[PDB]
Design a protein around this ligand. Sequence first.
Ligand code: HEM
Length: 386
Amino acid sequence: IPMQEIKSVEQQLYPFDIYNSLRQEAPIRYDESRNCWDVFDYETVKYILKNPSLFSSKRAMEERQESILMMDPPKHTKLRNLVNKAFTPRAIQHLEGHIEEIADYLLDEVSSKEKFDIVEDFAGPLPIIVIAELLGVPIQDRALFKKYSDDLVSGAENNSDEAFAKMMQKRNEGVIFLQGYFKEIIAERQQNKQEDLISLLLEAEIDGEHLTEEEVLGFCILLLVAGNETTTNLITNGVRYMTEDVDVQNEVRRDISLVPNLVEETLRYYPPIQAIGRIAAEDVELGECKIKRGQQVISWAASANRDSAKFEWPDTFVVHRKTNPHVSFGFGIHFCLGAPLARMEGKIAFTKLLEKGGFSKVQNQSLKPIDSPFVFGVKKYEIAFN
Ligand code: HEM
C-alpha cells in the first residue's frame, strides 16, 4: 500500500524527488491514510535504527517470524551472533571465483542474443545460484530451488483481487516447498555434515548454546527472502543507472577499481530497499512529533540517502565519494548480514558486464516497478551489448 504522494507509475520508478520534497516540508509526518509515521531525514532514520529498545523489530505473531529480522535483543543478539561468522567479508571472500564462474556462465548464455532481460537472464539467477552453493543445495536440485525462490516474490497478472490472490497462492506455495526442502536438507546435514553453510550453522556454538534446527530453517528462508530480490535489484538498479548515465558506466569500465564505489553509490541512489519498518515500543519525542507505543515508524532510506545534511551532491550519481554512509543496508544491530555477499555479487556482476563491453538500454520498454512500495526495482530491464 503506497503513499499518496506517489501517484503515477513514473513516480514509483523515480520517487526520490517526491521524498526529497517531503523531507524538506516534514522530516517526520503521520500519514493518516497508511496509519504510520514516515521519517525522511537521515539523522532521525539513523536514530530509529540505532535504538531497538525504543523502536522494535518485533511483529504480531500471526505474521511469519522471519528469523532474526523480526527479533529484538537479547534474543536477536544471541541468534545473530551464532550466524555472524559466516557472512563477514573474509569468510565469504573465497567465493569470488565461483560467483565469477556463474556470472560468466549467465552472460555466455546470452551471447548470440542481441538483447536480454538483465533480471531473468542474469541478475535474478545470480543470487539464487550463489546462495544455493552457499547454503549447500546440490546442483541437481537447483531447478526446483530456483523455481520456488522465484515463486517466493513473484508479481501479479493485474492489481486485482483475482491476481493478488493467485500470486499469494504462488508465493505461499513456495514458502511451503522451501520449508519442506530445507527441513529435508537441514536434517540430512544434521546427521552428516557437508562443506556448506547449513552444516556450519548447525555446528555453531556461543556460550554453549546452539541454534535449533527450526532456527536454521527460518534463517535459511530469511536468506532467500532477504537476499535474492534485493541483490537482483542491486544488479538491475545498477545496470539501469549505468544505462541512464552512460558516462558513469564508461568511467567505471576504464577504472575498474571504481566498481566498489559504483556498488555503494547504486545502493545509495537506487536503494533496493527504500523503507525500514519498526513498531514504537515506547512513547518517544522525535523533534516535535509525539510517537506513541504501538505505532508503526517507517524510516525511508531512499529519502535519508539523499539528505543534504549527510551527503554531498545527493541527487548526483558520483563514483568518487570518500565515504558513502547510506542506510541501504540499515544501520545498527540489524545491519544487513548479507552486505559483504551483496557487495561481492554486486561487484562481480558489474565487472563482468562492463568487461563484455558497452551496453545500452533497449528502446521502448514499459518498465514495470515492483509492486511493493518498500522495494525499489523493476521486474524487467532489457539491455543490449554494442
Ligand atoms: C543489495 C542487497 C541487499 C539489501 C539492499 C539488503 C537490505 C537489508 C536491510 C535494510 C536490512 C535491515 C532491515 C531492518 O533493519 O529491519 C537487511 C537485513 C538483513 N539482510 Fe539484507 N539486504 C541485501 C542483501 C542481502 C543478502 C544477499 C543477504 C543474505 C544472503 C541478506 C540478509 C539479510 C539478513 C539475514 C538480514 C537480517 C539481519 C538482522 O535482522 O539482524 N541481505 N537487509
